[PDB]
Amino acid sequence: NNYDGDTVTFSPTGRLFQVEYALEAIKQGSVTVGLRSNTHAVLVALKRNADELSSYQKKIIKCDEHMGLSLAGLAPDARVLSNYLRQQCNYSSLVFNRKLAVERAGHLLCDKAQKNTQSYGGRPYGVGLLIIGYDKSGAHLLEFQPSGNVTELYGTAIGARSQGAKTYLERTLDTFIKIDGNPDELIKAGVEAISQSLRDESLTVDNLSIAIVGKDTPFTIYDGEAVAKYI
Amino acid sequence: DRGVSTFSPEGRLFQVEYSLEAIKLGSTAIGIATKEGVVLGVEKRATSPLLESDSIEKIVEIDRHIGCAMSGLTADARSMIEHARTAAVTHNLYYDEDINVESLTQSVCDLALRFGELMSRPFGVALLIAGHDADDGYQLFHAEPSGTFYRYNAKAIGSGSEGAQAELLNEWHSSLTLKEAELLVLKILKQVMEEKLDENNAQLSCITKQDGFKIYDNEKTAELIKELKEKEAAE
Amino acid sequence: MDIILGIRVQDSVILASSKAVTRGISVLKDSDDKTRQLSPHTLMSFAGEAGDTVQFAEYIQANIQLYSIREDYELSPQAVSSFVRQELAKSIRSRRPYQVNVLIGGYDKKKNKPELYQIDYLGTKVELPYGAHGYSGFYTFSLLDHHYRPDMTTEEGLDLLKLCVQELEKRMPMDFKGVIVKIVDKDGIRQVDDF
Amino acid sequence: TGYDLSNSVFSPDGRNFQVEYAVKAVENGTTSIGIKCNDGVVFAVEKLITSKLLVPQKNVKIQVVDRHIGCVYSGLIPDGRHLVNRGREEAASFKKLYKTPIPIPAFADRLGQYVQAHTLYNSVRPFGVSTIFGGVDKNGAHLYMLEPSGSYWGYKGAATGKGRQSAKAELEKLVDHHPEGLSAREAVKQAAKIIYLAHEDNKEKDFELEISWCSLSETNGLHKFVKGDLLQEAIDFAQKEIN
Amino acid sequence: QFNPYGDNGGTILGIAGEDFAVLAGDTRNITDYSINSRYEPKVFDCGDNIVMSANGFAADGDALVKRFKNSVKWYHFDHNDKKLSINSAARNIQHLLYGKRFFPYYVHTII
Amino acid sequence: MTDRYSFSLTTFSPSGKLGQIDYALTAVKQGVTSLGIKATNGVVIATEKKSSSPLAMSETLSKVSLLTPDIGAVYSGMGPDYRVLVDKSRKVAHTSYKRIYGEYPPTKLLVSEVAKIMQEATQSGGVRPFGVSLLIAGHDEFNGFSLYQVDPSGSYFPWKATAIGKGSVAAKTFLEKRWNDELELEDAIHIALLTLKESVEGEFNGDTIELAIIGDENPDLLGYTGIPTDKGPRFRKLTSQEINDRLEAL
Amino acid sequence: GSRRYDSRTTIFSPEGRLYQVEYALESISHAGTAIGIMASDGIVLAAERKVTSTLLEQDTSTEKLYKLNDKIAVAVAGLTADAEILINTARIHAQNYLKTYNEDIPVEILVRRLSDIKQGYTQHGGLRPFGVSFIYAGYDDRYGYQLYTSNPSGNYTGWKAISVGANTSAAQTLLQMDYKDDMKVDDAIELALKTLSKTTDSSALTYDRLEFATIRKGANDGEVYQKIFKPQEIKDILVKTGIT
Amino acid sequence: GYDRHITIFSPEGRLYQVEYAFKATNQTNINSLAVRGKDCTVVISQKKVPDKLLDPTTVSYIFCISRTIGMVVNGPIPDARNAALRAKAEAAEFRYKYGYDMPCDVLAKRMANLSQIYTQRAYMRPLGVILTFVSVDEELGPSIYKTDPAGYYVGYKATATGPKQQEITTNLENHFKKSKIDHINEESWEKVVEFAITHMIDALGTEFSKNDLEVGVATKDKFFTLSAENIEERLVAIAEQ
Amino acid sequence: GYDRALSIFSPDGHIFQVEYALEAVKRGTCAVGVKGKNCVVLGCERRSTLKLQDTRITPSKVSKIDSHVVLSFSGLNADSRILIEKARVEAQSHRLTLEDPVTVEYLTRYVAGVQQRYTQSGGVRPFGVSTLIAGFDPRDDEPKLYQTEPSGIYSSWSAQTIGRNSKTVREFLEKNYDRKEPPATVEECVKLTVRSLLEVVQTGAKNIEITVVKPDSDIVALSSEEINQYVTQIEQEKQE
Numbered sequence A: 001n002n003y004d005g006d007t008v009t010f011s012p013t014g015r016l017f018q019v020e021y022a023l024e025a026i027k028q029g030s031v032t033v034g035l036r037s038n039t040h041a042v043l044v045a046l047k048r049n050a051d052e053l054s055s056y057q058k059k060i061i062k063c064d065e066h067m068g069l070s071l072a073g074l075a076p077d078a079r080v081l082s083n084y085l086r087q088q089c090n091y092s093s094l095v096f097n098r099k100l101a102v103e104r105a106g107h108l109l110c111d112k113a114q115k116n117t118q119s120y121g122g123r124p125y126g127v128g129l130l131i132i133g134y135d136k137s138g139a140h141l142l143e144f145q146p147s148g149n150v151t152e153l154y155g156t157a158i159g160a161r162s163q164g165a166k167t168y169l170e171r172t173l174d175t176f177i178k179i180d181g182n183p184d185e186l187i188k189a190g191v192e193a194i195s196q197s198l199r200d201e202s203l204t205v206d207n208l209s210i211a212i213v214g215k216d217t218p219f220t221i222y223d224g225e226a227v228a229k230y231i
Numbered sequence B: 001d002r003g004v005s006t007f008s009p010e011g012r013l014f015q016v017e018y019s020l021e022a023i024k025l026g027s028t029a030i031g032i033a034t035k036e037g038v039v040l041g042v043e044k045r046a047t048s049p050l051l052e053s054d055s056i057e058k059i060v061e062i063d064r065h066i067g068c069a070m071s072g073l074t075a076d077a078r079s080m081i082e083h084a085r086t087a088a089v090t091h092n093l094y095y096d097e098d099i100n101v102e103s104l105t106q107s108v109c110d111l112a113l114r115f116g117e118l119m120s121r122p123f124g125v126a127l128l129i130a131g132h133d134a135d136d137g138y139q140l141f142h143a144e145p146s147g148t149f150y151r152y153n154a155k156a157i158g159s160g161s162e163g164a165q166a167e168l169l170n171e172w173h174s175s176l177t178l179k180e181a182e183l184l185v186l187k188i189l190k191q192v193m194e195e196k197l198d199e200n201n202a203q204l205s206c207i208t209k210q211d212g213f214k215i216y217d218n219e220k221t222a223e224l225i226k227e228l229k230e231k232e233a234a235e
Numbered sequence C: 001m002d003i004i005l006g007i008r009v010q011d012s013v014i015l016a017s018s019k020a021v022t023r024g025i026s027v028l029k030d031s032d033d034k035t036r037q038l039s040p041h042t043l044m045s046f047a048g049e050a051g052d053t054v055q056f057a058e059y060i061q062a063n064i065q066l067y068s069i070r071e072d073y074e075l076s077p078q079a080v081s082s083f084v085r086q087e088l089a090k091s092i093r094s095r096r097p098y099q100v101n102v103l104i105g106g107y108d109k110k111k112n113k114p115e116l117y118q119i120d121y122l123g124t125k126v127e128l129p130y131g132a133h134g135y136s137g138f139y140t141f142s143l144l145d146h147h148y149r150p151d152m153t154t155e156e157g158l159d160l161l162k163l164c165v166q167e168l169e170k171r172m173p174m175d176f177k178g179v180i181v182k183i184v185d186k187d188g189i190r191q192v193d194d195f
Numbered sequence D: 001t002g003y004d005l006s007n008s009v010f011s012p013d014g015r016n017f018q019v020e021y022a023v024k025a026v027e028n029g030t031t032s033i034g035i036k037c038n039d040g041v042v043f044a045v046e047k048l049i050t051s052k053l054l055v056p057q058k059n060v061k062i063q064v065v066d067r068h069i070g071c072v073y074s075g076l077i078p079d080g081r082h083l084v085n086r087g088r089e090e091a092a093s094f095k096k097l098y099k100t101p102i103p104i105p106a107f108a109d110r111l112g113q114y115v116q117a118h119t120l121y122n123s124v125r126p127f128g129v130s131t132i133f134g135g136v137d138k139n140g141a142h143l144y145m146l147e148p149s150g151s152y153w154g155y156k157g158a159a160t161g162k163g164r165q166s167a168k169a170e171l172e173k174l175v176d177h178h179p180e181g182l183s184a185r186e187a188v189k190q191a192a193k194i195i196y197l198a199h200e201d202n203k204e205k206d207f208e209l210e211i212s213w214c215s216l217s218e219t220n221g222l223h224k225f226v227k228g229d230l231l232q233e234a235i236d237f238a239q240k241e242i243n
Numbered sequence E: 001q002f003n004p005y006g007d008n009g010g011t012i013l014g015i016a017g018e019d020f021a022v023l024a025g026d027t028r029n030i031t032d033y034s035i036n037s038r039y040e041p042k043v044f045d046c047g048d049n050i051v052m053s054a055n056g057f058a059a060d061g062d063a064l065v066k067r068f069k070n071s072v073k074w075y076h077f078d079h080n081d082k083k084l085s086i087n088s089a090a091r092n093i094q095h096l097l098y099g100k101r102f103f104p105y106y107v108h109t110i111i
Numbered sequence F: 001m002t003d004r005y006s007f008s009l010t011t012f013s014p015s016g017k018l019g020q021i022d023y024a025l026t027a028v029k030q031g032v033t034s035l036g037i038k039a040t041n042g043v044v045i046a047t048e049k050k051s052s053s054p055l056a057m058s059e060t061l062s063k064v065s066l067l068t069p070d071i072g073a074v075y076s077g078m079g080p081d082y083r084v085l086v087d088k089s090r091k092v093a094h095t096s097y098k099r100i101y102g103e104y105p106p107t108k109l110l111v112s113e114v115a116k117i118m119q120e121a122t123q124s125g126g127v128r129p130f131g132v133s134l135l136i137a138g139h140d141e142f143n144g145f146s147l148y149q150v151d152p153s154g155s156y157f158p159w160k161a162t163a164i165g166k167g168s169v170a171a172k173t174f175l176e177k178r179w180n181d182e183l184e185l186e187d188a189i190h191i192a193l194l195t196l197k198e199s200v201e202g203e204f205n206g207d208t209i210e211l212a213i214i215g216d217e218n219p220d221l222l223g224y225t226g227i228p229t230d231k232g233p234r235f236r237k238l239t240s241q242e243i244n245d246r247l248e249a250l
Numbered sequence G: 001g002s003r004r005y006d007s008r009t010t011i012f013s014p015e016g017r018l019y020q021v022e023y024a025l026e027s028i029s030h031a032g033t034a035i036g037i038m039a040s041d042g043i044v045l046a047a048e049r050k051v052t053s054t055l056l057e058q059d060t061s062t063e064k065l066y067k068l069n070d071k072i073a074v075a076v077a078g079l080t081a082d083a084e085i086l087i088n089t090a091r092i093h094a095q096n097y098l099k100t101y102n103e104d105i106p107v108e109i110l111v112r113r114l115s116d117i118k119q120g121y122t123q124h125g126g127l128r129p130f131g132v133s134f135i136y137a138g139y140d141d142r143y144g145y146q147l148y149t150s151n152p153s154g155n156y157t158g159w160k161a162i163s164v165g166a167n168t169s170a171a172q173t174l175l176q177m178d179y180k181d182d183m184k185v186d187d188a189i190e191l192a193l194k195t196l197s198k199t200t201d202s203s204a205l206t207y208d209r210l211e212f213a214t215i216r217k218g219a220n221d222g223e224v225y226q227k228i229f230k231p232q233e234i235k236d237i238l239v240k241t242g243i244t
Numbered sequence H: 001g002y003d004r005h006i007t008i009f010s011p012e013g014r015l016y017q018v019e020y021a022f023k024a025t026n027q028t029n030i031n032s033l034a035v036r037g038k039d040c041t042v043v044i045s046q047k048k049v050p051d052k053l054l055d056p057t058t059v060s061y062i063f064c065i066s067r068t069i070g071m072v073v074n075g076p077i078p079d080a081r082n083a084a085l086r087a088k089a090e091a092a093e094f095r096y097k098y099g100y101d102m103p104c105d106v107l108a109k110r111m112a113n114l115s116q117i118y119t120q121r122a123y124m125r126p127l128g129v130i131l132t133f134v135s136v137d138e139e140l141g142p143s144i145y146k147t148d149p150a151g152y153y154v155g156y157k158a159t160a161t162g163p164k165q166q167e168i169t170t171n172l173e174n175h176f177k178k179s180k181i182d183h184i185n186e187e188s189w190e191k192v193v194e195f196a197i198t199h200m201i202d203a204l205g206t207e208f209s210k211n212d213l214e215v216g217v218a219t220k221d222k223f224f225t226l227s228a229e230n231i232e233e234r235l236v237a238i239a240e241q
Numbered sequence I: 001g002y003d004r005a006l007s008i009f010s011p012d013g014h015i016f017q018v019e020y021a022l023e024a025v026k027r028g029t030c031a032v033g034v035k036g037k038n039c040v041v042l043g044c045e046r047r048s049t050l051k052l053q054d055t056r057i058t059p060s061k062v063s064k065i066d067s068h069v070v071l072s073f074s075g076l077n078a079d080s081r082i083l084i085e086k087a088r089v090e091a092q093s094h095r096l097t098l099e100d101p102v103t104v105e106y107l108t109r110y111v112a113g114v115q116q117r118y119t120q121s122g123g124v125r126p127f128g129v130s131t132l133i134a135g136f137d138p139r140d141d142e143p144k145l146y147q148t149e150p151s152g153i154y155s156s157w158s159a160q161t162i163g164r165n166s167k168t169v170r171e172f173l174e175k176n177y178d179r180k181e182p183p184a185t186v187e188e189c190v191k192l193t194v195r196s197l198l199e200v201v202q203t204g205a206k207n208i209e210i211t212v213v214k215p216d217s218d219i220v221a222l223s224s225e226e227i228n229q230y231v232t233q234i235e236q237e238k239q240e
């Protein structure tokens, strides 16, 4: 109310409204899902168009050969943050000949988002990210919130109506975590997960976006006729 | 007052949303993409009859393979065009090749959110970027001050946009010829414009693989206007 | 570069400047004009380091032209010479100093008098009845000490100048390919085409 | 009024309301504690299990600074990470110039001055965390608690978060019943009990327990996480006491 | 006075056919009259069917190959995974080299 | 972080007033009375030493300060503001004058530099004006003795005699009746003590009054001999005992 | 942040005026009147001191009239402290020109630069403008005798006769009435004193409330002399015209 | 009314932020006192440790700034420690630059100057603290100098600070009216400490255990704080008379 | 450095500081540009509430940017000096690098760019100035007239006016200027310009300034009598 003019102000109950308003931009975003087994990690994203004459806004971005993310909210902010991750992954490779641990990637995003919540003039990032990767400790899934909070999960979803997929994955937990050495089945589970968040619209060929990374699979994105297999 | 980079309670940036209102006050610009080329057309809208209309420059070349149309606070577009041209030429210097249309558009959109307390405010102008490259063929992009860009088969921006866009939804198909697209831009511009459309208050342009980006003469557009009026009377 | 001369007579300043541009064992050009007009009644000739000369000349020209447009007025030859001196005096303690020697010939319209200033790259300014830069002075000064009179006409000045060029063409080691001669008086700056 | 709209402004009381508002953010966070013992310190924290989908043991909250200091905090988690990052920078520069690892009181003032600095200007926000931290140096064991204002003291036991009062009461009993001192292994068990007892004030979601310790005899003066057999033993001790 | 350059010896060779190209190099690495390694490869696959060698001062050679490999990576990131053609690679390498015009990479480069 | 206050805090109001300067002068009005009188062969500056507690040692707090050997200053208003102004004033007499000309600045020019410093606190970003009015007394070879007033705005005026602060209105009127252009330094000291008694309420002695003169050169206060041209400071602070001697023949 | 306390000194009103400039002019309208009159053989500067006290040292005083170089002087209306900042800049600028070109600075060039500095404080930097209006009186060999005025906006104009500060409206009407082009310096001296005498807010105009200066070619042959009047000389010139 | 939020003048020529910083001074509800002997300067302050979980040895408002200078603070501990670190750094630099130990009064002036800046510059708040500096200066002898958020400072014969400062002040005034001298006419610092505690007891009307007090003593060439047992030894001596 | 974003968007999509800068232009004295078949004429109003002016030394309303291009303006006088100075410096810089004087379009494009920059830079307000820029390109005889405004937009005009009551004089020019036949001579162009100002001015005495620019750096300012003859002639044809 009187305490939402900037990020540098606390409300009387200890809230940061600018950070909460940034969180709200994610809620308006199109639904995206993340889930993993012990061998692979999978992103599924519902893409959004302006109208029938426009393209469908790309939701998934590659960060390295072993890492990448999906976005929900302000897309330019995802571009800034993904670019930062690309550099951090890159620095680790050039300087230490070391693939950046998905966990460190989370810590680095947390600290970059945090600085924008304590200084005058700045604003919080207005985007949520789901980071998947395969590193020296196996497959991983992370959830980034622009409050700075990063969380490691077996599965999750962010965006509008994400609660449907998040409930489904919570039920399916014991099944999909043991889909080891089978990419097409882990994707099927993720495609069924994102279907619990659809209303009046169904998954089409220029609507669905799937990404996968794992033991013997570089981070690769599927669009167009390559996702027809899964509808 | 309040910070320039402040979020609204609905999760949107005040200044970005307000600049979108400035663009709705701008003159209409329409683009249509075909397999034979991309057409760009704009309403000139002279504020007075004494103003020499050919000095109104709302369609602009970025490179031989990329052109651009604008709507809103058009003075804001000068540095955007300057950046676009430098980005295009610089990429050719570094890589001995043409820069992809999408890469150009992404570069222009990188300027957009570089405001705050960097420039003092967002741009008050939207851009239609049209071009050709070997990988993805003929392309049309709508670049906004939000930093977001969508690829379009056809798109209208400015005061007559929502009416013109609804018209473009009905008319566009994946088999339109370049000539069919030219006439369609003229037809839809004539519909949404205030004053009566002629060769002096509207301008056409296209980009083709073979001949690159070309702004049409007033003589060439006048004949397309005459061809359009004759075809509408012919049924 | 190489030869630049100047003679102030009763009513005008005459500047003579060599036409050759030599690099290595090749004379690359024999029609080079080593001069810039700073204002309607002020002319500057220059000699020195390659690149530096024209760059400095044109920089001074731009500044005097800027002043002219701002004030709708022409600076006196004395004022222009002092501006040029200061620029060179700054330059001599820079990271890379301008290695340029200049002569400034002007007609002061307020005084109705010709004026000739000799300024070297260090910023050493002197007003003179006659001037030279480089090795040229070693022949011309003594010659002019003998034949020069303060009341000479423009025609007498040109004959006096012919005598200098002749001496230089006889005793100087290098072929400087003749001179371009220009006259500064009450009516401005004009070039003698047949010298 | 309006005295509460800007950091570093004194109210007519002589208070900085923005700091007091940051304290509200800390009171909203989960419970964390510190127990000082014979030759070291023990840290424990409550991790609310929001969903089945959280990977157990894999969202670690206790943080190490240098090799001998442990830090835990309640409130805005990102703010706590910022403070630890600074703590690590401070400790590195102390070890660089002076060779010896940073003493705990020295480290405490480094964090204190840094947090205090964020109450001096209106262009920064106070920290939304209270931080419990400590370790072992050349003078033995030290436990500290640092608040948003920059205020810190040495503690026999410390608690912050939603269950701070419950935990404080439980801590005071240990101080009264053990005047001679508590052993490191005992303090680990007690930490588990206190977190379980402090969980009553946050009992909708069930939780995951996380413990760490520094002890001159048990961990050789270095910070280590309590895992496996020692953790399950501590969990069981706690489960027996609530029933 | 410290000399920032050295000479690691070796030699390289590139030949082009109608539908193929070879890039060869010996595997010996030296300083002065000593052998550092009998097998230290200096011909590398840089992705997008481009092979590269920068022969002379190995520290500069490795630095350049490292920077170009990284350049290929970012070309994909910035231009929708587009393949970097050999002519575009060549132009890019010119700028990598000329950027250190007044403190040169002490190498002969072949791709 | 960093000073984000790069804008003026003193601005013009619709009526034309500069609010913060006016309010600074109001602070000066609340301040304890100080005065200056110019004689033919010297200048006297005086003020009351308002003690904050009887446990405080008022000798450790000097209201009258030496700026150069021939220039002294006193004030009315905010003490802390005055103290830092004296530091700055002493330094600027060196940096912008003595280090250039090898001699101390004349009174009018040192006054001019202090006025500049106070003017800048009226226009620069993120600062309030100084809450003090200064009275600066001094001597220099080519101008003789002089007395100046510097206000929060940065304005300065030369005075034959004047007062500033609490009871300045009454004190100025008292000085107008007593001042003539033939006053000898001792006559000016006498009038200074008389004028101050009107504004002082409690104890009136050499421990509650601070008083200094600009008069003859004091060779005994130089600290060295052997240079004929160096003859000693003209600034001298009267001792507590020297004040009481004059309070008997009052 | 600090946005809260920003007055925004360099913005437009809805009517297209600059608030701070307008308010600075309002401040200047309460300052003592200063008059400049340009004659064919010289220039007069006359200014009224702000309500004097009898114990003010009148001879060693300067408040209104300042020397910029040997050929240019200024009359001040507004905050004196603000004026001295600008006067020192102007003095340095004059010397820079003399050092560069070996000729004394033409009056307009000096006036333009000082006016340009004022302009800057109204467009950028977020600082309050200088609350000062100047009357420039000077001579150069291009235009001869010249009077200019500048104000807080940074706008400057040339005059035959002009007033700044208090009661300019009444002062200008009086000057417009009795001024003619063939006027001499001694006539201009009289007009200046007569105008101040009629527009003054005081009871009667006396020597101790005035500063006076002339810029004549009344030296010896083709050169210009600046005469800042001493107290006694103002007392005499006030008697000579029969005001006292 | 933004003139109450930053350090600019109010219409009546006041600085409210400075005034409110003075009120922050009493936020700890602790009273301090300083007196001078012949050879020493003693400072005492109340020690209130309410929480049983606190380590009492770490609760302190007396600081050793240098070997010769001690400082007691009245005000919140974060601001108190901010002032102490700066004072330590300033005193260390002075010694390096000028070749001799920083006098108590000079450090006081310097810290007072820093405080003055925060009353004039907008981006910096005043510190809500009052700093009492004590030493036995090699030139001036036993010294007490005190700083506040206004940037004011002065030397004292003796002084007191805190919520109940006026009671202690008048108590001390009345003693020095009687004794007719500027100090405590005592040989040992032990008895000057005893005098200090005695006159604090009388003025506050409370009894102290060994853990209710905090004592700093400055002698020639060193300032030191007393342990609980040093104070207990001192409390026993007062009781047995 | 002072950073405040002074020019920002409002909810309706307007930048008020730019729009208020236009109000300052509307307050300024009227300026008019008319281009003929072989010339451009710049006319300027001078308000007459200022008697006792010295017109020798007072800043003229039309400024030479180079020997071939001129600039007049409406709005804040102090602001215009900054634009004129920058334009004059760019004029000399262009001659230095391109070895050719500026085109009128280029000089205008530069001036407009400067104005635009002051609408999205922190810590600055927009220029309270609109300009008329007229002249002839090097080695060209086609007349050029351009107009700029605070927002940064610029365009070419056959004839245009700015300043107070400019809407009245624009009305006059809109019915009195034939695009098919521009004023064929200098005399015709000066007259149409003087006529248009007389719709708004008052007395045709020392209230109107006229400057004529012809090809190849041929610029001259008319004197009082020369202008007064146009005023006298127009009034006698009017009484009909």
Ligand SMILES: [Cl-]
Residues within 6 Å of the ligand: H109, H110, H113, H114
């Ligand atoms: Cl200091």
